[PDB]
Amino acid sequence: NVAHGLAWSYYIGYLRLILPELQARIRTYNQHRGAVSQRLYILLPLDCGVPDNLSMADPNIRFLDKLPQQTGDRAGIKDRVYSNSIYELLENGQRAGTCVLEYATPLQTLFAMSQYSQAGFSREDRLEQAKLFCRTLEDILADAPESQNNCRLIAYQEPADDSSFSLSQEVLRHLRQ
Amino acid sequence: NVAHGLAWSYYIGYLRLILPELQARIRTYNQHRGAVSQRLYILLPLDCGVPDNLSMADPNIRFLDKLPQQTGDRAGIKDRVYSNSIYELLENGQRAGTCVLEYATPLQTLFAMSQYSQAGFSREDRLEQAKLFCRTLEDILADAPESQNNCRLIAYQEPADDSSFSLSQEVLRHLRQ
Ligand SMILES: O=C(O)CCC(=O)c1cc(-c2c[nH]c3c(F)cccc23)cs1
Ligand SMILES: O=C(O)CCC(=O)c1cc(-c2c[nH]c3c(F)cccc23)cs1
């Protein structure tokens, strides 16, 4: 299935390469008002909507700073640059958590494939494939050596057509545990 | 199939985002001994072997310089950095071409999946899936609006067990046309 390959490729081509150096980069930031959490938090919206600006998805998610960059030679790209962003999570006007946060970009591919006739991916299959992506990635990371309390997947389905939804509260549930 | 999804994800998640700005970045480099070619050259080894150092794959492929970086907000990563590398191609001691060059990183995922028992991808399926990746990507890019004489795929199979192979000569065949 499409989602199976995408989950494996996201581990192999991205997470396996950034997760081993992540806690070092975070420790460095914290040492040079509240330490940044030690894990990469990955947003997995099951509606596969991936905005590029996180603060427009919820005003209580506020960009704070960039992590120091990681670079490595990758596939002929000399000093390929991996950048990641740190966010503050607010709750009733209070800073309640700080963490490295981003969306899983493969879900934006599921979204786009579903709109392109030539991709052979029907619009109505997005949700099932997003669920399959989330399950496959969780199963990969549970057994992966580069994941050492390094990463937390935050999967969520914003309520059917309508009701109240808070992305920042979804992240905070995981941060608190 | 695995390769179908990976080809679509490589277009959607990478090429669609860097190709529109590529000729601008190249024009800038050329203006601020022989101009860099106007296209991104993508190496598609059908054996799915993707080294991170290109000059160790062939001594006639020599790193020259980095393209100026492109940055954009991407999935919550503020100023996500896209770096690309420029190479000189030599032939009998002469510089015969200059171009932005890198490997298609999805082929390294096909290679890795084929070695991981949990990925359900048999070792003997690599070649067929690499061929399918190459065909799917060519068909995507042929109809893609962001590809305007912007990109050239270089697919090759290094001779069965043994005979002479020159990666630099493979790239030069395409550069010359
Ligand atoms: O996506 C960004 O730009 C920030 C994260 C990053 O640098 C990378 C992501 C992947 C990747 C592996 N598989 C993918 C897929 F199936 C769809 C989209 C992206 C990817 C390789 S590197
Ligand atoms: O791979 C690098 O780090 C340099 C190029 C780059 O930045 C990106 C690549 C992709 C990607 C989309 N699909 C992929 C897949 F299936 C396997 C591996 C990578 C990718 C997203 S961004």
Residue numbers in the entry:
A (entry chain A), B (entry chain A): 154 to 185, 191 to 335
Q: What do the paper's sentences say?
A:
STING is vital for the functioning of both the innate and adaptive immune responses. When located within the intracellular endoplasmic reticulum (ER), STING undergoes structural changes and moves to the Golgi apparatus upon receiving its natural ligand, 2′3′cGMP‐AMP (cGAMP), which is synthesized by its upstream sensor, cyclic GMP‐AMP synthase (cGAS). Herein, we developed and identified a non‐nucleotide STING agonist called DW18343.
High‐quality electron density enables unambiguous modeling of DW18343. LBD dimerization forms a ligand‐binding pocket with a four‐stranded lid, where two DW18343 molecules interact via pi–pi interactions of their thiophene and indole rings. Specifically, the ketone group, thiophene ring, and carboxyl group of each DW18343 form hydrogen bonds with Arg238 and Thr263 of its proximal LBD, respectively; the hydrophobic interaction between Tyr167 and the ketone group strengthens binding; the indole ring of each DW18343 interacts with Pro264 through hydrophobic interactions and forms a hydrogen bond with Ser162 of its proximal LBD. These interactions collectively induce the closed contraction conformation of LBDs, distinct from the open conformation observed with di‐GMP or diABZ. Although the conformation of the DW18343‐bound LBDs resembles that with other agonists (MSA‐2, SR‐717, or cGAMP), the binding pose of DW18343 is unique, residing deeper into the pocket formed by the dimerized LBDs.
